[PDB]
């Protein structure tokens, strides 16, 4: 539960760091954002579940 | 007092506040890269 | 060659670092008050 929480919360940080540097260069070079429109979508969708994971999961650790 | 669990992020949260300033800064990194058009 | 805009943003952060070290030194050095 705890490590499980620190995983979700900690991974959620690296995804953000990755997501943050990503989306930019994404819409940036139109070399796609059609193939990456796929990547970004998964990052975005993923992120939300994560927040919800850490959200609900918070009430069990603290 | 960052709830017991998040304590591991104390240090991280220590720098977050200053970020906004960075953006005003970046805008300059950019223009420089794009040769002040 | 090395792109100018990079020479700058690098030499730049480089100064905020040294000048920032000075500001830290103000709450620890001899110039402290403690």
């Amino acid at each position: 539960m705890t490590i499980l929480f620190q995983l979700a919360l900690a991974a959620l940080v690296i995804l953000s760091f990755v997501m943050v540097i990503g989306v930019p260069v994404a819409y940036a070079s139109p070399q796609d954002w059609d193939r990456s429109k796929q990547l970004i979508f998964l990052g975005s969708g993923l992120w939300i579940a994560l927040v919800l994971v850490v959200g609900v999961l918070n009430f069990f650790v603290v | 007092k960052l709830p017991e669990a998040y304590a591991i992020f104390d240090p991280l949260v220590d720098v977050l506040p200053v970020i906004p300033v960075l953006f005003l800064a970046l805008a300059f990194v950019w223009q420089a890269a794009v040769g002040f058009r | 060659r090395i792109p100018l805009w990079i020479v700058a943003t690098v030499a730049g952060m480089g100064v905020i670092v040294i000048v920032g070290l000075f500001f830290y030194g103000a709450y620890a050095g001899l110039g402290s008050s403690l």
């Binding site: 070399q31 | 960075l22 970046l26 | 792109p3």
Partner: peptide
Amino acid sequence: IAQLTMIAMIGIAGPMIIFLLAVRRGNL
């Protein structure tokens, strides 16, 4: 102790997301 580790990365991040664009040359 030394969360300067943090700053550092999120710091070279700003210039990075434009540099990679200087490489993939486009939209600056």
